[PDB]
Amino acid sequence: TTGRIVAVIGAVVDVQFDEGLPPILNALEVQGRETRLVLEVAQHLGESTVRTIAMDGTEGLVRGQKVLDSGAPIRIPVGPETLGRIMNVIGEPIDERGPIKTKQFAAIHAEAPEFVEMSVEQEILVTGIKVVDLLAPYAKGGKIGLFGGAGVGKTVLIMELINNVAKAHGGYSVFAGVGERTREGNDLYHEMIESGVINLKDATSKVALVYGQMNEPPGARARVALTGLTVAEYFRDQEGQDVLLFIDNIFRFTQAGSEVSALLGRIPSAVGYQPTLATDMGTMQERITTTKKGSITSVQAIYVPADDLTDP
Amino acid sequence: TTGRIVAVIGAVVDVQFDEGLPPILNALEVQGRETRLVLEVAQHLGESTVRTIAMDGTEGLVRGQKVLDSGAPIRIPVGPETLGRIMNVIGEPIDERGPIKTKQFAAIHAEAPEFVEMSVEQEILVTGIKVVDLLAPYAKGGKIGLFGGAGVGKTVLIMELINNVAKAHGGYSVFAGVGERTREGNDLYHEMIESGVINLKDATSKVALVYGQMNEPPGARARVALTGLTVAEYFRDQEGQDVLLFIDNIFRFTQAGSEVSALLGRIPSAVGYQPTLATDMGTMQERITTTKKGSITSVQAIYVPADDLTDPAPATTFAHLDATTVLSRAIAELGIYPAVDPLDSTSRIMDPNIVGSEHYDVARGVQKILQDYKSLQDIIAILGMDELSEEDKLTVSRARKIQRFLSQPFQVAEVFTGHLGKLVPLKETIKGFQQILAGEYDHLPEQAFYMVGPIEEAVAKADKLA
Amino acid sequence: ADTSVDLEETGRVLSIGDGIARVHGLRNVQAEEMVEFSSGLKGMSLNLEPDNVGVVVFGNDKLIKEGDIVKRTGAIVDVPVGEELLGRVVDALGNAIDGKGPIGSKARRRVGLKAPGIIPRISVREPMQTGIKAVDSLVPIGRGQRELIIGDRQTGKTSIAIDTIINQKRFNDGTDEKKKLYCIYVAIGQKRSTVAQLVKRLTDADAMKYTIVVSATASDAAPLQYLAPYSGCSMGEYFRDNGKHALIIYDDLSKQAVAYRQMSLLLRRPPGREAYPGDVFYLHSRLLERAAKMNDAFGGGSLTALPVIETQAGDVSAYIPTNVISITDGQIFLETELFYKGIRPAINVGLSVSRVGSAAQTRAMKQVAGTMKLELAQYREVAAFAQFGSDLDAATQQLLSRGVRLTELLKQGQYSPMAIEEQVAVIYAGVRGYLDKLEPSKITKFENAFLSHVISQHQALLGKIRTDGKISEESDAKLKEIVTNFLAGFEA
Amino acid sequence: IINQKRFNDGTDEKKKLYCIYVAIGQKRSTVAQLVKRLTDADAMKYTIVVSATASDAAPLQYLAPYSGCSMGEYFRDNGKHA
Amino acid sequence: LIIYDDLSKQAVAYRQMSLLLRRPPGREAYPGDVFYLHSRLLERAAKMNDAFGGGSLTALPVIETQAGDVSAYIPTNVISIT
Amino acid sequence: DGQIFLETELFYKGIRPAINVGLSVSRVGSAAQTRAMKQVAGTMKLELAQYREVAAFAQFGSDLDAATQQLLSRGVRLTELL
Ligand SMILES: Nc1ncnc2c1ncn2[C@@H]1O[C@H](COP(=O)(O)OP(=O)(O)NP(=O)(O)O)[C@@H](O)[C@H]1O
């Protein structure tokens, strides 16, 4: 259906539908704009109004502008032809290399695997790297904290992990850059082509790239970790692989979500963080586990603030 | 007349009276309930509506349910017929021995005794507890505060104190369990029946019990302290005797307040407390006192949250007290019991003109030797004892011996520390700490002073180590 | 005027978001009355206002729109209870999540009930056997008692609970109904794999058959996590009120705390200490009171509670931990500095105490644990000096000798609980000196060796401690016999 | 307050110091010990004791310092020292 | 080459407006989009390829810290930004 | 016009009144004293402030020239006298 803009405040937009309302989390298409603008339904304020969080700049907006409900959450291309492609939070190809022609589109939101679909087995994902597999083994369908940034070849270790999982286990990887610096985005892009994982010619690519850049609003930074997870979720259930998911960096995902909760107007919890912090973490981190069909094993780069491990 | 429930948030209920609106503090009765749900008025919201704080669980309340004013605040039995009986906040007895049969009843809300009614007599109360009787000794009909964080030794100390003073007491005693463990009542009741202070066969019963434990909703915990102290008020005024009032835990009164203050429609103060913390405590605490008509010796254990002695709750409680006995975790974790901080505890009675200049000069000497040891503790903390001067090396050695001679085996501590409980006469305590201060025992080892009664047992303890 | 929809039993929903749904109508709903949504999802009627009902959603808020039809149930938040749950895994509500069909529930109980008062109780007396040597000897838990497990993350907290659950099979394999123990494990704010990998482990140990698992993992909605402990607590109370003995483990309350803090802050209730609402003490007060030991007149049933708390970097003085110290009848501390050292279970003996649990210990244990606690404090009497070999005194060097052995003995493997007499036998070994010669490097190896030997060969001698509940002069001297000749035979 | 007994029991009139002791939110018994203390030392005679103790409503305690400061102001303005 | 001297003072100037436009306050009274205020400003600096002329803009933000605290909300923002 | 600060350390160490000579000040100063008090207290406050400092610095075992021994001897005596 159709709704109108009743309010524009920073990165939070309110839209009034006449008849039926979009359920919470449904993507909204703002019409008549230069590029694509997505508004994610966050609340129902009553009086047939919804409160939405934008994924892009909210300048030039007119009160009353027609907004389209997509009838579903933020849907993104999934399927083998998302490999070697730089994606953004709404699926759009941001490598200027022509539109991603995938058969299926999947919504970035989805419930965690049921209790019945869980893996009662604890297995080891053999990385091929000695230090890892012997002393600090990765759990297949588990979650690994990567401490320390670049200057020690973080980028390499990641790429070798992508190579060696694709090699040893025949499973693809997904890099979700939460708060990616655009210089570092470009730099990481060519580093992957120059080494072999991204293949600009054929289909031998092993990674799907999703970029939530810094110059994008908190909505985009808070949801891109899902847009990456959903591309990875296809290769777990539809092709039954042992998938690999990189999040860099997880703290900027937490700070992204704190900003959103701060924007909607929620009373802040301890240390300034969001009240929904526990769940804001739970509803995503519980999609990353070993199912009956496959498994996603996630390597997450962590920033600790004030080097305080007790920091929430 | 009748009043209708228009709103229900938590334990805070809103009742609308079309006819004759009931005043503040009045007790209301909810109809259509299996057991007596009392609502106590807190405010008039305008438009024939009042705001009340419930005295029990609010589950199963329908918007419309009739309520009836009782033309009086909450009313409870008082007098000698309550002795040996346990009752809840609203007076209903909970020891399943039938209802409490009296002629005399009272209201749990009362004004504080007028300035003229205050007493000025100051006389010492021996306890047989060394760290207390020396450095912060309680006074007959005085206000005693037992401060302590979680699991530090309050409920154990206040139980020892009962065994010491309450049992060997002529007059009556009132115990008020406020927001602590329920088994902590089932312990006290069965232990008291056993000791005779509560008699079931006849009525020679000496202690009155009132409970509102941590199972009760905020409203009940908020007013249950008042219930107890009102039972104590009577034995002071209407019979004019020596009442002993015991409260554990006094913090749960302000905590319960904290729980409702939000819903009452206040704006939160410091630490998110009730803005009314200052006076909420005042009007209630000033009642618990000795008057010219009778005397109340009040021992109130005070829970400290997050070991934060600056939290608005324990920090406001000091002002209401005559003797403060502060229990410290650091001391407790050093295996010192009772874990009483010998420099943070104070008594208004510590005045040579009362305890005697001989008592005072030993208390001031022990405190000086301990303050000096504490001020050297940052240098020894890095360097170790080896590096001190030969003058200071002695003061350290004595202060440490004193530290352990301030520890004591309680009679209630027996049934888990294996040591026979001890009470120490005041002349033995003063003469004890004098001798350590005088240097008579610089040859005995430190651990010989650890967990012993009189000083003559340190000598015995040293001889054992052959 | 009307011939259709009613406002007394039906709602409308004026607004939805931030977890709460403002409902229009519902004129005759109650406080904490359960309600239903047009999408099957259930809610609790928490707020009753002149123009709306505030309802807490037990699930994803995305499923609810403005204008959805809200229906009554009349029953105040209740849960399916009974014996038809033993061996099952349910959610905070009580619905089957193990996919093994529905429960055949013949009884229901309220989640929001009050704890037994002063008279219906009696001081704990019955032994709640953990099967762990360090607990059952030094920190004795009793049936009807609350004991806290507290410590930093990854310090063995959960392991103490499970080995205690596995342990109870030795009683439920018996026919004696008055010594059996039924279990309830409430998982809050965890990973769904961690719960799933636990029921598998419990199954592989024939423990599940006497166990109920309530699961509201990290992924579950915040109020589901909130409701969870109380739901299963009532499922425990059932055994208590029937003259049976039950055990509930809350893993953990710190994660249920943040869940409730989320609710309170979304509700806009005054953030206080550590942003926690004024009633986070109450949240855990009303729940843990419900663990109780009933007197004979009430049926002699007991609910025994083991709640878990996750400290940050050893900080016990923190708000939430201090609260639970002031709720429970004792604590067990698990220092990271003993765990990341090899000592497992990593119980701080100098901090953990069990208040009302002493007079619920086996006498045979008291005969060995009494002089163990005495000599362990005599060793903890500052023996940090450590490195000197034979450069110290004479009477104090043996206390260093005794300690490390009496320390190594308390080390114990996972998933392997021990009968009370099996414990008093291996403790007897060090507590008398029959390990003073032996190299500290070997005490572990010696245990397994000596322990399975008395299991194999000397069941007669074991049965004669078990039955007698006391180490008789006859058994003591026949046990001296066993350790001396085995020690000489022992090949280091 | 007690040191002022010298100046108040002598001829000297412009060395006279009058006293106002204002108690705020204190214990009534404490305030009573205090006024006894002064009456024993016979200093109470030249001493006004304004009392808004912990039992008094907060609005009154708010006002008590000001009230005594008006009582002091009388001496202050009319050629006396308080 | 551009030098924002300083971004801590623009952060104050922005905060005022939000607080007075009545946007929700967060840590140190800063709105949700103050990270977003600086993230879009400083990414604008880049080095273009010979495809786009090969020109470059180079950024130098200044941040004032109090008592050396680099873990203050605004500094924490810009540290990661850059 | 200044304050009188009291510490528990000084109180328990013996010093009563437990006045902290370093932290407390008087903004009227000698102008509030009799010319008899000024003749003996004219420089005493700043003297003891310098003594209290050199007392905690000289406890490190350093051999002290008689000039800083003179101030050490004077400071101990005057603290006992007050
Ligand atoms: N007795 C033991 N021997 C050897 N390993 C153990 C023992 N107990 C626990 N562990 C190991 O130590 C880890 C921590 O144990 P766990 O029961 O999860 O403690 P925890 O505090 O509940 N962890 P968490 O709940 O995630 O903060 C587990 O991965 C076990 O493999």
Ligand SMILES: Nc1ncnc2c1ncn2[C@@H]1O[C@H](COP(=O)(O)OP(=O)(O)NP(=O)(O)O)[C@@H](O)[C@H]1O
């Ligand atoms: N005098 C004593 N001797 C030996 N042990 C003691 C003594 N006092 C306290 N303890 C121990 O320390 C613990 C604390 O005692 P307790 O009476 O519960 O203090 P508390 O502050 O009232 N606890 P809580 O109400 O939970 O905050 C007990 O479990 C005792 O084992």
Ligand SMILES: [Mg+2]
């Ligand atoms: Mg206690």
Ligand SMILES: [Mg+2]
């Ligand atoms: Mg665990």
